[PDB]
Design a protein around this ligand. Structure first.
Ligand SMILES: Nc1ncnc2c1ncn2[C@@H]1O[C@H](COP(=O)(O)OP(=O)(O)O)[C@@H](O)[C@H]1O
Ligand SMILES: Nc1ncnc2c1ncn2[C@@H]1O[C@H](COP(=O)(O)OP(=O)(O)O)[C@@H](O)[C@H]1O
Ligand SMILES: [K+]
Ligand SMILES: [K+]
Lengths: 521, 521
């Protein structure tokens, strides 16, 4: 059917579709063009996906699942997994050497989910978002993954899609999808593309080359634990301390309160990408006490400046790993919501001596956008080939006229079988004979063409030069046999040659060389 | 250099060479195509090899050495050795558990020779025979051994050759060499070959199978003390008795006289394979008395009939040991001089219910002949490989034309890199668009082939169907990357796809299955 493009993100997922000449990024049933990569199991046994899972206020953070993408396709003893489980608030356990997420699904009933089963639930939500917009079933998808993902990680992502009811036609790299969204695949020459992807949870820098249709990921770097959520956490520590100082109320260890503030902090952060002040207000925040503070851009930047500056080192490293200078970068692509932060845009522009990044696609939708473009191309796989093969003459066929001139009867690329005729005459008064020399080739003089045969037409009646009309006909039959006739239209006197393939057939090497001189005259 | 084939025989040795398309069996300096496996040390300290050693009249048979092949590669306490030394007229002694031949080499000076040192002297004679014919040094040989020879016996034979200055490239079995001489290796199916080898000293019957290039020796039997020399000895006992009766002269215990008669008896025996009477005459045979008797075939047969009949039991035994019936024998190969005896040929033909043996190679040269054929094959080991590897397209590449038809642009096994083009047109009047679907596979309909990608060519100007000329080009570059272009030759409007290996590459298992349908159309 119609193929969708899905950005299956660490913190947010996005679905697009190429429809009626345009990429549409599809809003979910909450009206959001991105969906949290979140699943929550309630004590009553209800399952929440997306905004409802993330925005769910609970005193128990242990049955809310996120960051499945950190675990997908990995073994338990992967040092990345052993690091990650330390900070994840839900239980991760080993079963037959693989990490499983352990939750209470209802009334103390424990279940273990594979990371790809959690991601399958997120992809089900993205599928349904697309199905609501299109008003038809979605069966096929292009799904993106980080460039550094190995085969096990790509297959587990495929498996997530399969479980969600999607035929995952292609897994493509996130930075490549962003490049495709910006049309950078459709350009001539060797271009160097720096993709700077600062999302909610991770920072990924990729050096891609585009050369004559081929994308190569040359080098990757970044920080797997640096994203927008770390900036939120700096604002959080600050406002928790400030609230404690102003009211004596310590909101830490009350998860419900932490969630309400974190959500307001995240909205304020986004506002500070457009303006220099933002109000955080929560009516009855903590025991009838309202929350009311404002955050300046300067304070937001001050609380995070070390984290913002740290994004430049991975850029430096991919440049040296790709053996490129700053000036060798033809294209800067900003990906991820956090690239909307003016200080981040400033730090990247300054690093690249004032070079402007690509602009026009929302940075948190660009990967989904590129996936949707690629999905559009692959939806054409069910089209029908509406081409007819033509049988054509591979070389110009003609005769020698006075001065050793190649006079064409059947131009190269004439559809065969065919019959073509021209009228010829005498070069001298009372000329009694014609010699018809049949040539193959594209050169204007027959000395440079291939002789196929000769015959005479005798008994031309007396007349002044140019008066007799001799019709020369070239006929190629359904068997590709060439027959040449010369007939005196005055008398009906005629002669013919049948030209055979035997022993005076050019090799396809010889033909290619002759075809080089085609389209000169 | 040129490799020779040597039959190192119990009683006679034979050397051949594959030269200028033919096996030549090489005559020695006496003009004989076989050479006695004999060495003699004269009282004056001269060493004789071949005909000169055997034909040497002496009153001392103790310093003439033969039958080294009975001892080669064996231990002193081998029951075969303990049996054999009883009848051998030269001294055999034990040194460090191995049998040595002890002779007077000159003036009462004793020397002990390893059996392989005696065989090395015979192989030196065969090497020199070959060198005289070729007029160049012979460095390499294939040497034959009985099928029943163990590793020690094969190595001691190799060692004999090494001592004689030969690189013994291969030791091959006598019956296999005879089969090879008769071309029985170069035939289809499973064939059963009975090799009947009656030489001067031993009888060997071998059941070989030939199956798809592989020879197996399935069973062997025979009699190690039954050969032409036993037939000679029956004629000898008869004529010694007859001479004693007619003259009172007893030639026994006069070795010189015994030798002269034995030599005449052997020539008469050979004549009786071609005619039914033979004259034995020796002028001044014993004290001025001439010898003059004739021998009939009937008397020769009568004196030996029990020995001739005894050759059938070993044939019976190899048939039951190989679990075959007479009728299962596809090929009878007669080897050894004694197979020229008509009564022996008759007994074998009758045993096999009138089946004809192989014919055309002298039975006493057939083993050398096969060795020479094998030598010919191994002389090719110093040739140079004059092949160039081609880089070729493993599967047909093309596009879908109307009706879901696979229209090839690059046939399977086209040399790459390459560029191939065909001309296509519209299926309908004023058709505005082409869809180019790029397929890989050998099947005539693209539903059964592998889709590599699709692209469109838009903006085809109005014309009647079949009039526009769209050139489709398939290009495989030095990196094996496929690029497909479609260009409207009318306008220069064109589009292109670059096809990557990633995620739509067939497995070598899938390719093999598709290649099964190659060469159908
Ligand atoms: N205007 C904005 N200013 C600052 N951060 C933003 C803005 N919009 C979104 N973000 C942040 O972007 C992050 C999400 O990144 P995104 O690219 O959507 O996906 P992912 O986290 O899956 O890579 C969150 O931390 C979010 O707060
Ligand atoms: N025409 C023949 N008739 C009978 N016996 C023959 C004939 N030619 C050769 N022989 C015998 O063949 C024997 C030699 O066998 P041969 O195959 O040459 O080698 P080997 O003894 O080494 O196996 C001798 O006994 C010789 O007399
Ligand atoms: K995302
Ligand atoms: K022999």
């Amino acid at each position: 059917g119609t193929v969708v493009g899905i950005d299956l993100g660490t913190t947010y997922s996005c679905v697009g579709v190429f429809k009626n000449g345009r990429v549409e990024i599809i809003a979910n049933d909450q009206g959001n063009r991105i969906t949290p990569s979140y699943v929550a199991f309630t004590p009553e046994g209800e399952r929440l996906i997306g905004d409802a899972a993330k925005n769910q206020l609970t005193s128990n953070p242990e049955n809310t699942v996120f960051d499945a993408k950190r675990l997908i396709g990995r073994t338990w003893n992967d040092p990345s997994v052993q690091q990650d489980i330390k900070f994840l608030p839900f239980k991760v356990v080993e079963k037959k050497t693989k990490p499983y997420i352990q939750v209470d699904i209802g009334g103390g009933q424990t279940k273990t989910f594979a990371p790809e089963e959690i991601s399958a639930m997120v992809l089900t939500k993205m599928k349904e978002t697309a199905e609501a917009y299109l008003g038809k079933k979605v069966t096929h998808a292009v799904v993106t993954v980080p460039a550094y993902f190995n085969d096990a990680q790509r297959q587990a992502t495929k498996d997530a899609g399969t479980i969600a009811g999607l035929n995952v036609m292609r897994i493509i790299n996130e930075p490549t999808a962003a490049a495709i969204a910006y049309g950078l695949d459709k350009r001539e020459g060797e271009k160097n593309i720096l993709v700077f992807d600062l999302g909610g949870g991770a920072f990924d820098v990729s050096l891609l080359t585009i050369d004559n249709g081929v994308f190569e990921v040359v080098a990757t770097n970044g920080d797997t634990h640096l994203g927008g959520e770390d900036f939120d956490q700096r604002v959080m520590e600050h406002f928790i301390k400030l609230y404690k100082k102003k009211t004596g109320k310590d909101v830490r260890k009350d998860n419900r309160a932490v969630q309400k503030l974190r959500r307001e902090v995240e909205k304020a952060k986004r506002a500070l990408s457009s303006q220099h002040q933002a109000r955080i207000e929560i009516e009855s925040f903590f025991e009838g006490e309202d929350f009311s503070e404002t955050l300046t851009r300067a304070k937001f930047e001050e609380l995070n400046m070390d984290l913002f500056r740290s994004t430049m080192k991975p850029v430096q490293k991919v440049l040296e790993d790709s053996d490129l200078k700053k000036s060798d970068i033809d294209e800067i692509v900003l990906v991820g919501g956090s690239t909307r932060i003016p200080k981040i845009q400033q730090l990247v522009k300054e690093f690249f001596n004032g070079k402007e990044p690509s602009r026009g696609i929302n940075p948190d939708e660009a990967v989904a956008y590129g996936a949707a473009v690629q999905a559009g191309v692959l939806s054409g796989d069910q089209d029908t080939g509406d081409l007819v093969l033509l049988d054509v003459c591979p070389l110009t066929l003609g005769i020698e006229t006075v001065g050793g001139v190649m006079t064409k009867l059947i131009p190269r690329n004439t559809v065969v079988p065919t019959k073509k005729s021209q009228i010829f005459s005498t070069a001298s008064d009372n000329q009694p004979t014609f010699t018809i020399k049949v040539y193959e080739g594209e050169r204007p003089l027959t000395k440079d063409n291939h002789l196929l045969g000769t015959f005479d037409l005798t008994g031309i009646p007396p007349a002044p030069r140019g008066v007799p009309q001799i019709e020369v006909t070239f006929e190629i039959d359904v068997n590709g046999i060439l027959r040449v006739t010369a007939e005196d239209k005055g008398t009906g006197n005629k002669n013919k040659i049948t030209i055979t393939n035997d022993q005076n057939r050019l090799t396809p090497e010889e033909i290619e060389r002759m075809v080089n001189d085609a389209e000169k005259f």
